[PDB]
């Protein structure tokens, strides 16, 4: 499924996450934008094996299990899968437990390089939330 | 690929500092932590200390708290290993280690979660 900019910010805002650890909801629509161009079925393979799946690009070695990956320590303890859903509950849930590790939404690359400081609120401007 | 270069090391007295860089470059624009790592003779590698740069927080092994600093300038991918009140027990080789990963921080001085590494530099605390 490939959310609409607004119809994500009204589910994500349904789903707690404005203003989690601090980030204003923007932050994390804007994070859905550039980590998988609101796709939830974006999945990326990395050369330690590890592939990055759905909304947040949540990655296998560290969060969730795949079955595949080397050296998996599955924090979220959620299967992969769980998070190419159309539903975003389990990629937030585990988003939730990421951004808690101690750097914030720093977790997110596409974030830090095309969110981080901007005017996120743009992304939930027009929403009618 | 990101080439990772130590400079400075050699021999200080007890209780003397020294100081060691570690440079970056390569694909330097993914960098999400730099570490010190140690081995000392007839042990195993541990982390000494990690810095996560794109925040500056840093992560140290009980050994040096209070003893060895940690920093950076992330401008020029630079990670820096300031060891003030060194002690018999610091002598070792320092390797300077990077990865492209955002590690959990309860990974951040497990060797295992490195991609990259310099040379490794002696130190020796007389």
């Known amino acids: 499924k490939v959310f609409g900019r607004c119809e994500l910010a009204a589910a994500m805002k349904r789903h707690g996450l404005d203003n989690y650890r601090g980030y204003s909801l923007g932050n994390w629509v804007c994070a859905a934008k550039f980590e998988s161009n609101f796709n939830t079925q974006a999945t990326n393979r990395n050369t330690d094996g590890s592939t990055d799946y759905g909304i947040l690009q949540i990655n296998s070695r560290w969060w969730c299990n795949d079955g595949r990956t080397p050296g998996s320590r599955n924090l979220c303890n959620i299967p992969c899968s769980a998070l190419l859903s159309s539903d975003i509950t389990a990629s937030v849930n585990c988003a939730k437990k990421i951004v808690s590790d101690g750097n914030g939404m720093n977790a997110w690359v596409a974030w830090r390089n095309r969110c981080k400081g901007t005017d996120v609120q743009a992304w939930i401007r027009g929403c009618r939330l | 690929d990101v080439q990772l270069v130590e400079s400075g090391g050699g021999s200080v007295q007890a209780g003397g500092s020294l100081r060691l860089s570690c440079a970056a470059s390569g694909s330097t624009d993914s960098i999400e932590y730099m570490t010190w790592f140690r081995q000392a003779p007839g042990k195993a590698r541990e982390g000494v200390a990690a810095?996560?740069?794109?925040?500056?927080?840093?992560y140290y092994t009980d050994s040096v708290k209070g003893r060895f600093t940690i920093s950076q300038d992330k401008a020029k991918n630079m990670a820096y290993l300031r060891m003030d009140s060194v002690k018999s027990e610091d002598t070792a080789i320092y390797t300077c280690?990077?990865?492209?990963?955002?590690?959990?921080?309860?990974?951040?001085?497990?060797?295992?979660?490195?991609?990259?590494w310099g040379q490794g530099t002696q130190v020796t605390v007389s």
């Open positions: 810095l996560y740069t794109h925040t500056g927080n840093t």
């Open positions: 280690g990077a990865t492209r990963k955002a590690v959990p921080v309860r990974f951040a001085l497990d060797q295992s979660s490195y991609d990259y």
